[PDB]
């Protein structure tokens, strides 16, 4: 179908592809001469013909791959129909001919690029696919399923009564490959098509599940694991599809995991399938107690699979304190029980867990005593809600094992004590320190093996983190004397841990550590003056100690310590310890650090200026790059993540330096702003970099301010790029930071910091964020969002901040988004309602009584919201009613006092932590109506005190100050009057010196002192500094 002149040219080019001189003369010719609007048709026709008919493996394979790549970007839509027909028929004829397996796979991928909505129907393929699925050649059946995987719309095109038995045949096919293909294509259907199409194939799930036992019979464990991996994807998509046969799939995975003659992939995948149900259908897992029973049982079984053919754990005692990467099932079981526990809670999991725990701790199989410990460790956080009250029993179980004959069981017991010290904190620190500390300290002796000593030491880090200095003080000497011994170990990882443990004990001990400084600091210096990590940890310990004891004590060794830092710095995990130590020294020395900036900042400036580092890569070289954790890929794009992670790290340090040194950091602000902060916003392939750039902007500005054309110019530049990001930023979480960064920027720059160009572009940004938020939330048979509540919470802030800096002028610009706002107000979902209510509350403050245009548009919805079951909605509503009578008295007269009845009702589970906030706003709103325009004033009084909402408390008490300066004055409510004030002051909600001498006037008209006989010593001393 091609001129022989063209064939030989292109054949030379494609053959040239596998050979650099001959090679890229060819791909330059391909890229510049043949991928053109005049040659693309010829080029596609050629490659299709080569892949279909060439008997050279290489050329056929290459052409099929090239065709796939090129058919996309042409795109196939703009190809003349008569060549598309030519390309289709030849690909199809090549597919139905005699080809190698891999080539038919590539033919399949090529064919798939010739199927589309846009494109003319291709009934020849559909007919070809159906006859191919019935073939005796597995590769024909496999390739057909593969095509249906790429283009699952085709499953719709075929008559249902043909496609269904095809899949049922596929699930039970004699070939493993075909089966895996069938399962992949089946799940792929749900991956690509709308949910309204799912019920067409959903009925095939029991057929699939019934096919699974066959894999165990044939001993096909790896094919089973592949099928599990597809089923796991299906559980994330349509968990409820598994409802009716939940028991059998639960019992099947149980059966697979218990069969420990199988290779790990079958059993780890099986466990993941179990696990994933808890993450996608928890109500379903909870409604069936056979699930939890099975999940607990099998994870426990797998956690016993440690130190196989090594009962002494000799290999474990001799190795360092890292994980054995070979104990795969053990590790998988730990993470699994953790994930499920976090999803289902202790009310469901604790009982079946402890049924086994009771039993396993007593076994002679040390591996089961070990496994019991690790299992409790994994489930503790997620079962915390329950286990936090069963804490002496847990310790009664665990603590006796701390001297188990087997050192790996001891280790396990140290693990639990450490783990629950985190998960049950701070309550376990306050109530079990007399048991946990002596148990851990006892394992520090050189009687125990290195591994147990070290892990006991690690557990002490966990405990310390939430133990107050007063709790630790009587244990400090014992702790340290022991740790000093660990410090003299010949085993490096023991020393390293000892240092870290001392450090974080010191951090918790604070000024209680001062008496230990003299004994420790020399031992540290000797370590440093002599193994990179050791020094890094030793430098960390030294500076954490320094921060604990304070500047004065630290000054005894600071300059020597600094000189050693300098030596270490200018001589990869070490660099992180050093950077953090520098930053901690800055916290300690305060302003005295400033001469050290020329040493500390330039390394950071380099790392923080890192460019995004991205190489656009081919689809084959895609996974190839992602083996390494420091690289990720998402045309295809290879990003170097760690380089950008370190970019964020450096920016975070620059942040803290800027924050600590304030004005002393001004000299860097311009550079950091223009070269680092602002460019970071354009980093569209790394979320963290963008957020770090944003948070940096207000803190940079405050530095320069504290120490002007520069300041104003940089703010104009930074605000504009922030504002400009609101309409481009796809990530809602990042969007929130931008608004928050604008609030703080505005707060720094002050009054009228925005031009009305910016005020306009800000409004377009807000509307775009609101529009996209609405659509994302406007979205069951198959299935059972705080990120967006938070975004809307800061949009409230920025609008409020912008209103304040414009001193009202932004009312004009906000007019254009009220239809958006109004939609939100009436909407079902409380999140959108709360947002709107807060906005309207801010509007009236600057737009009362400018808002008569809006009055009857929101008040009908506001008055409903008053009685709403959601406290958040009542509060925001009560506030609006209140601010109506405060800033727009006469425009809202006909509304405020009719609602004065409802406020008196809502005002009375009201005085309770959950809704204490809501009822104080209503209390405030009542006080506002009473002020603006009399049984109500006495009703409002016993809503006092106001102790949570500060804005609300502020008004209520100088309404109280003005009511006197009737029912409040004289009388015998004088003890309730005073106490109403004392409570607000003491609770730090009340601004009140207005009211204090209003009270002092009343006490003069009397018995005066006896009113304070109620209050204890600590509150009385505050009273005396008050009156």
């Amino acid at each position: 179908a091609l001129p022989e002149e063209v064939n030989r040219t292109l054949l030379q080019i494609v053959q040239a592809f596998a050979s650099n001189q001959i090679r890229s003369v060819a791909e330059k010719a391909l890229s510049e001469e043949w991928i053109t609007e005049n040659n693309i048709e010829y080029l596609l026709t050629f490659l299709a013909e080569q892949a279909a008919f060439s008997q050279d493996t290489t050329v056929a394979a290459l052409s099929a791959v090239l065709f796939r790549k090129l058919a996309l970007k042409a795109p196939i839509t703009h190809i003349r129909k008569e060549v598309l027909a030519q390309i289709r028929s030849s690909l199809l004829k090549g597919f139905l001919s005699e080809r190698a397996d891999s080539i038919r796979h590539k033919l399949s991928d090529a064919i798939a690029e010739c199927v589309q909505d846009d494109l003319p129907a291709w009934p020849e393929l559909l007919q070809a696919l159906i006859e191919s699925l019935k073939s005796g050649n597995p590769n024909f059946r496999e390739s057909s399923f593969r095509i249906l995987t790429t283009v699952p719309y085709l499953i719709t095109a075929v008559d249902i009564n043909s496609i269904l038995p095809i899949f049922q045949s596929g699930f039970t096919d004699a070939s493993d490959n075909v089966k895996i293909a069938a399962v992949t294509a089946f799940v792929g259907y749900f991956k690509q098509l709308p949910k309204s199409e799912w019920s067409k194939l959903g009925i095939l799930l029991p057929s699939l599940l019934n096919s699974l036992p066959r894999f165990l019979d044939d001993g096909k464990d790896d094919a089973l694991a592949s099928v599990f991996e597809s089923l796991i994807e299906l559980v994330e998509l349509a968990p409820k599809l598994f409802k009716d046969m939940f028991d059998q799939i639960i019992q099947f995975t149980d059966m697979v995991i218990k069969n420990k003659d199988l290779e790990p992939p079958a059993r780890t995948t099986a466990l993941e399938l179990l696990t994933v149900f808890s993450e996608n259908a928890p109500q379903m897992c909870k409604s069936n107690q056979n699930y939890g029973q099975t999940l607990v049982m099998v994870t426990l079984i797998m956690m016993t699979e440690v130190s196989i053919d090594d009962d002494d754990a000799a290999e474990w005692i001799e190795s360092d304190d890292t994980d054995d990467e070979e104990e795969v099932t053990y590790d998988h079981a730990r993470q699994a029980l953790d994930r499920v526990a976090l999803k289902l809670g202790g009310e469901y999991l604790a009982a079946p867990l402890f049924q086994y725990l009771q039993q396993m701790i007593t076994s002679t199989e040390w591996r089961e005593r070990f496994a019991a410990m690790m299992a409790l460790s994994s489930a503790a956080e997620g079962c915390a809600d329950v286990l936090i009250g069963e804490i002496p029993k847990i310790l009664d179980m665990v603590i006796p094992l701390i001297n188990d004959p087997h050192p790996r069981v001891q280790y396990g017991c140290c693990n639990v004590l450490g783990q629950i010290s985190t998960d049950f904190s701070p309550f376990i620190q306050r109530t079990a320190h007399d048991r946990i500390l002596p148990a851990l300290i006892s394992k520090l002796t050189s009687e125990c093996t290195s591994r147990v000593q070290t892990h006991a030491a690690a557990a002490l880090v966990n405990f310390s983190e939430f133990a107050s200095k007063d709790i630790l003080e009587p244990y400090l000497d014992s702790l340290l004397t022991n740790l000093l011994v660990l410090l003299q170990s010949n085993k490096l990882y023991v020393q390293e841990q000892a240092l870290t443990t001392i450090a974080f004990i010191a951090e918790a001990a604070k000024n209680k550590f001062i008496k230990y400084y003299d004994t420790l600091m020399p031992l540290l210096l000797n370590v440093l003056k002599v193994n990179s990590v050791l020094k890094g940890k030793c430098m960390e310990c030294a500076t954490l100690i320094g921060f604990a004891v304070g500047k004065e004590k630290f000054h005894e060794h600071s300059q020597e310590l600094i000189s050693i830092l300098v030596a270490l710095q200018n001589s990869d995990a070490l660099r992180s310890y050093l950077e953090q130590s520098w930053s901690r020294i800055c916290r300690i020395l305060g302003d005295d650090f400033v001469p050290l900036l020329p040493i500390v900042i330039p390394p950071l400036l380099i790392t923080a200026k890192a460019t995004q580092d991205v190489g656009l890569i081919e689809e084959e070289e895609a996974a190839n790059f992602q083996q390494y954790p420091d690289w990720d890929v998402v045309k295809h794009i290879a990003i170097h993540t760690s380089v950008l992670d370190d970019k964020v790290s450096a920016m975070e340090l620059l942040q803290s330096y800027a924050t600590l040194l304030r004005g002393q950091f001004a000299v860097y602000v311009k550079e950091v702003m223009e070269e680092i902060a602002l460019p970071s916003l354009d980093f569209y392939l790394h979320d963290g970099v963008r957020a770090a750039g944003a948070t940096l902007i207000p803190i940079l500005l405050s530095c320069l301010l504290a120490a002007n054309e520069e300041l104003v110019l940089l703010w104009h530049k930074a605000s504009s790029k922030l504002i400009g990001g609101l309409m481009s930023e796809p990530m809602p979480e990042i969007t929130q930071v931008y608004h928050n960064s604008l609030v703080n920027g505005i707060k720094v720059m002050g009054d009228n910091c925005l031009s009305e160009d910016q005020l306009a572009a800000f409004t377009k940004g807000v509307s775009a964020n609101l529009t996209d938020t609405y659509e994302r939330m406007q979205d069951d048979e198959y299935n059972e969002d705080f990120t967006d509540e938070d975004l809307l919470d800061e949009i409230n802030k920025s609008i409020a901040a912008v209103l304040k800096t414009t001193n009202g002028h932004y009312l004009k610009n906000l007019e254009n988004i009220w239809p958006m706002i109004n939609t939100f107000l009436l909407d079902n979902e409380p999140i959108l309602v709360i947002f709107a209510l807060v906005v309207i509350g801010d509007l009236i403050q600057y737009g009362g009584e400018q808002t008569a245009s809006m009055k009857n548009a929101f008040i009908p919805k506001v008055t409903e919201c008053l009685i709403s079951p959601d406290a958040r909605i009542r509060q925001a509503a009560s506030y609006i009613i209140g601010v109506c009578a405060q800033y727009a008295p006469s425009t809202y007269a006909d509304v405020c006092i009719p609602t004065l009845d409802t406020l008196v009702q809502i005002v009375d589970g009201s005085k309770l932590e959950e809704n204490r906030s809501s009822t104080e706003n209503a209390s405030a709103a009542i006080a506002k109506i009473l002020y603006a325009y009399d049984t109500y004033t006495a009703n409002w009084f016993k809503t006092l005190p106001t102790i949570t909402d500060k804005e609300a408390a502020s008004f209520n008490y100088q309404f109280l100050s003005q009511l006197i300066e009737p029912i409040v004055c004289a009388q015998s409510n004088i003890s309730a009057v005073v106490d109403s004030v004392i409570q607000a002051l003491n609770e730090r909600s009340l601004e009140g010196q207005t009211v204090i001498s209003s009270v002092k006037k009343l006490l003069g008209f009397l018995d005066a002192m006896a009113i304070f006989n109620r209050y204890p010593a600590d509150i009385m001393e505050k009273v005396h500094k008050w009156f």
Binding site: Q335, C414, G418, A459, V461, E465
Partner: peptide
């Protein structure tokens, strides 16, 4: 210290 994987 002690963490979960």
């Amino acid at each position: 210290g002690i963490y979960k994987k």
